[PDB]
Amino acid sequence: MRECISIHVGQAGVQIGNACWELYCLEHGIQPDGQMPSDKTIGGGDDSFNTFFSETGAGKHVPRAVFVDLEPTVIDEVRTGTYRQLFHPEQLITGKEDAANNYARGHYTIGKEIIDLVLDRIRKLADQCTGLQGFLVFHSFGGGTGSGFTSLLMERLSVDYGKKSKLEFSIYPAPQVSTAVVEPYNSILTTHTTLEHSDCAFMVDNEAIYDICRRNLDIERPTYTNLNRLISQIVSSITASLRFDGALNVDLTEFQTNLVPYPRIHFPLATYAPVISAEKAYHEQLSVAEITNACFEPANQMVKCDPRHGKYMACCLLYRGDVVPKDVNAAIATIKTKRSIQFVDWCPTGFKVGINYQPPTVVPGGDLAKVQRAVCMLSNTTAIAEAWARLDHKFDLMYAKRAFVHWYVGEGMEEGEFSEAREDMAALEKDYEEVGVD
Amino acid sequence: MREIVHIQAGQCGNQIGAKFWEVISDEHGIDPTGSYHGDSDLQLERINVYYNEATGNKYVPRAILVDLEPGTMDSVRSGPFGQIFRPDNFVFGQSGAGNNWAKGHYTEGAELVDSVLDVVRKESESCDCLQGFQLTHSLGGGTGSGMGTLLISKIREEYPDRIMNTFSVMPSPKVSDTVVEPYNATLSVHQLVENTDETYCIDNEALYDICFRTLKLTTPTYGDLNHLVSATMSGVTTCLRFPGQLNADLRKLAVNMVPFPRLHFFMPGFAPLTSRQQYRALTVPELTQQMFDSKNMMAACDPRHGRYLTVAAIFRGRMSMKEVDEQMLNVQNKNSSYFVEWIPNNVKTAVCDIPPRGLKMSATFIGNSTAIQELFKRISEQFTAMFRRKAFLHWYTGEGMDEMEFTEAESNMNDLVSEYQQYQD
Amino acid sequence: MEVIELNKCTSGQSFEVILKPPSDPSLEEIQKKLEAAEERRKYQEAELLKHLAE
Amino acid sequence: MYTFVVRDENSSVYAEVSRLLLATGQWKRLRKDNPRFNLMLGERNRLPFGRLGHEPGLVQLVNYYRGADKLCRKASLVKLIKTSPELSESCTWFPESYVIYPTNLTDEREVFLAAYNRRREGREGNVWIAKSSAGAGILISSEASELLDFIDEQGQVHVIQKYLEKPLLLEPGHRKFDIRSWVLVDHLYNIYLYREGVLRTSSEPYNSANFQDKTCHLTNHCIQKEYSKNYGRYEEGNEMFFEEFNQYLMDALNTTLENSILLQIKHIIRSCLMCIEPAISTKHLHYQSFQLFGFDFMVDEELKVWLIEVNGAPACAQKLYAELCQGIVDVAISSVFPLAPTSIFIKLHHHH
Ligand SMILES: Nc1nc2c(ncn2[C@@H]2O[C@H](COP(=O)(O)OP(=O)(O)OP(=O)(O)O)[C@@H](O)[C@H]2O)c(=O)[nH]1
Ligand SMILES: Nc1ncnc2c1ncn2[C@@H]1O[C@H](COP(=O)(O)OP(=O)(O)CP(=O)(O)O)[C@@H](O)[C@H]1O
Ligand SMILES: Nc1nc2c(ncn2[C@@H]2O[C@H](COP(=O)(O)OP(=O)(O)O)[C@@H](O)[C@H]2O)c(=O)[nH]1
Ligand SMILES: CC(=O)N1c2ccccc2CC[C@@H]1C
Ligand SMILES: [Ca+2]
């Protein structure tokens, strides 16, 4: 058994982490007080869930996580929430003044003073691992901590844990749920300094989560709670292989091997379905073909874009629930005759498929209804470049006027780190177009 | 714990600041003696941002009252909530400033400045984590203008990494105490361009015209004007005083509203504004057509004469937050010719469930528009009209000032207008 | 349309389908980046103080 | 008060649409870089589709279907017809064509020679024509050596297709011609066919014994007005409209335009558009697309209709600018952004 340490950075990371471990506990049968009845190995054991939880002599199952925020207000909810008994206080790190949505402030000014402290708390969780696989780092693009301090942490993690893998769950900025105007700047800054330090990253576009909540769940104005309970479902499906018995994606190394033939192009597109509102009396339970077919609809993508106009480099299908292999291939054939799937000429036109029999778990009183089967498709399409193209454009509109640049220089960043970062995205966009278009 | 230190200087400063504390003290359920008697825990959630907690569950405003004559502050201490302020936080002299910037900034004020800072230091030392400062004051007079800017220049010297916010009343000839208000105003503007992060510009002419034309008062008084600034001051500080998903921080709001260090002069606005047909409920669309209308803005600048750099609207009341979003997007998408196209999504909206006293719902407007240049244009015009003949200069040169300093203040503001002009094209 | 590497356990199973065949900075360098920007902050703050002293 | 932007100043078609939109007093034009727009008249090449549909509260419409170039490129079209089973290599209305890459750069050179050697052995008329999208540059010859040698002298992708050696000739004159039909496709993917078409006729008598001179074989509007000496003799501007061309078919061949040619054209338009519907449909997308198309057909002496090419940015006939443009607003724009007949289109119903 090999452990996985999760790192949540900033408001977005911390709240999303809040909704993931809530879900992990409901899945693995862990109670809020940290007790797990089904675990017959008291205070020990190398089970599949032990990759994410540790055990004490008193039978407590403690997450292998670390929350970090440059401001205590958001993490303070965790210390007094329902799951306050899962973490010991050292796992929750907080400053006193945030980064004011300023990448420079999170990376240089305030980051320097707290980086050594974070690494040490992580060094404590690492010392408990008999074979640490890597790290899962949740954070946002727009936040000054989620962008500025993450890249600094990533840099140090590649120095103190060279051979370990690092996966990100990054939140793409969407104007519908953001009061910050400089988020483009932060996004491009953090993607530039993090790129070389992340082996695989799952972007989630808030605009996509927002619409999925309004269209499928009938939530006129969704809160972060709604967006996070949904985002954690995707996260749960993407990590299930690591926490359960199985054979596909059994450790973090398998995510790069199965989804990233080119290191820089390490941004897979996630898709999920079905998303059914619990307010509906009862719904016609979808078959394997119907939920698989839905994975090729734009409405169900974590990042809005048109996959019909790219080229796939790799592709996984993760099923949960009443699903058998015969039904999977059945739908696949039906779809390879209707859809537009253009593979790159240097990669096989194949799908790796994993099936977990336990259906998706839903939070009591939550927004999602209980389904008998569901699928999450991870596909590395050149079409996701549209995301970069949108963001890059907004960056160019402001940088042409040097708007808001002074807030960054005043924190110690040189104006050149902008154009340098931007020239790295221009390079990143080029690599996607060299791989996708004819 | 993100505490703010309030400072009000001069006659206008303290009278406006007084009603400000009278307004929010009522919103947070604090009585005239400092005892809490509200009914919602939302009143106390962020109460320590503008109030210190004493013994016996007493809340003392974190305010510092400053003036060079005792007259005004005597009135505050005997006003409605006068007793609520810290006795030691009253710092004042007896010489007065004679409505002279030079006196407030160089002679009389200089003799009293060190003691004010001694109080500010006492308030900051007790702050767990100090957000920054906010100063109410006018620019036409001598104390709030002359000594006010002197305070900022010294507060920035001791707390260089804290936010410096101000509500500044601008002088208009139609609401003038003395003819030298352009001299005092031009001198203060240069200080604020350098040593402030955000400045809410309030034109006494706009306040008057709102009281005469919109509110239908046959004879407005400084008291009438001050009620508006009270409600407007409460409006823009809602993000800070009540809980919400916004996460409002003085440095976060500055980072999101000030694309350039010198263009930090905002036009505030309030809605509704009804004459006494006053109990009529207001739909969400109506709040928004008024909030963006010039007649509800208090800088006396027609936004249709410039372009918006950034806009921050706050809504208060139990309304359809879905309807709020739709209406803001409607105003943006119907006049996108007044919002610069090179700052994506430069309009942000915040909601708050607690309405101001005596209103089902309301909206407050905070715009960083280039039309504010028209403001500084008027001042620079009134200024040169007298400085070209050296008229009234003796009041100032007698206090040690040279004509050179005036010519500099002049150029510093004409540059500020040019800067506001290139971004409008 | 081939199916390979079929693994079956109690909690699920996984397989592979093929439709068609194919055709860093050190700890010293990061401490310098950090301290370099910490210096440009000290310089700017020094020039602000000098300006205030004038 | 809807808003739109303009990113193609050389578009003769949509230039009129912008004039009618403003004439209604209900549409407002914005700078070509303002992202707060309802409608985009986009550029021809490299239209930033990825940036559309991401402005909260705005329903956005564009006048180009992403992927339509699959149908409007000489090479892409050929590859589409041969590879798509909806059309198959046995497609009856598309000339036997092949995609040929210059030898200085898949490629169907050997396949082309096989069908060429078979014809030469069978005494069949073996005249072929070479062309490309990068032309104003065409060559018609009966020798395979001249065709291939002409392509190697360039540096872009070319296509060689069987030259229709028996084109229907109008009388008097004994002259070639092609048919241009304008077809509109709205967001819902209804296929409207403008009831008015044009025939861009040749003013020179057809001559099958001299492909050197290319003025009686090419019916383009620019070649007949620059290299032809009988321009405008029989009809004004070498353009005959469906009213006159219908009478001619009745007086000569004893048949109607609807039966003899229109049915096939309506079937070619349907077949081509239905084929790529799953790939360009904006039905479940975050924005909406509509695009005007100009099909170019050939008619042979057997009254069979052949598909030449499809223009994705076509120009209209001077006489049909008003009626057509006004209809574009009716069925395409206002159908999404309503304003405060006897349609001029023939709806080609189909299964989605
Ligand atoms: N999906 C989701 N997005 C969030 C959440 N919280 C914040 N965001 C997004 O994150 C972006 C802002 O980043 P924050 O996480 O608030 O910034 P931060 O990490 O706290 O850094 P600071 O600027 O120092 O506060 C906005 O675009 C928000 O939409 C959340 O709980 N869920
Ligand atoms: N296989 C073929 N048989 C007969 N004629 C042909 C032909 N291929 C091309 N032509 C002639 O060429 C003309 C069309 O050329 P083509 O459309 O390929 O070039 P082009 O696209 O630059 C002109 P446009 O796009 O403006 O219609 C027609 O008038 C037709 O007479
Ligand atoms: N809105 C408002 N403006 C005032 C008030 N008192 C004075 N002013 C304005 O402030 C300027 C005079 O400044 P003053 O308060 O005398 O400055 P002081 O020297 O610090 O007392 C003039 O332009 C007045 O119009 C007031 O109570 N309310
Ligand atoms: C004296 C006073 O109250 N005000 C004033 C002050 C100076 C000049 C005119 C006026 C007119 C009313 C205005 C409210
Ligand atoms: Ca165990």
Ligand SMILES: [Ca+2]
């Ligand atoms: Ca590494």
Ligand SMILES: [Ca+2]
């Ligand atoms: Ca004295």
Ligand SMILES: [Mg+2]
């Ligand atoms: Mg934060």
Ligand SMILES: [Mg+2]
């Ligand atoms: Mg006075």
Ligand SMILES: [Mg+2]
């Ligand atoms: Mg062409």
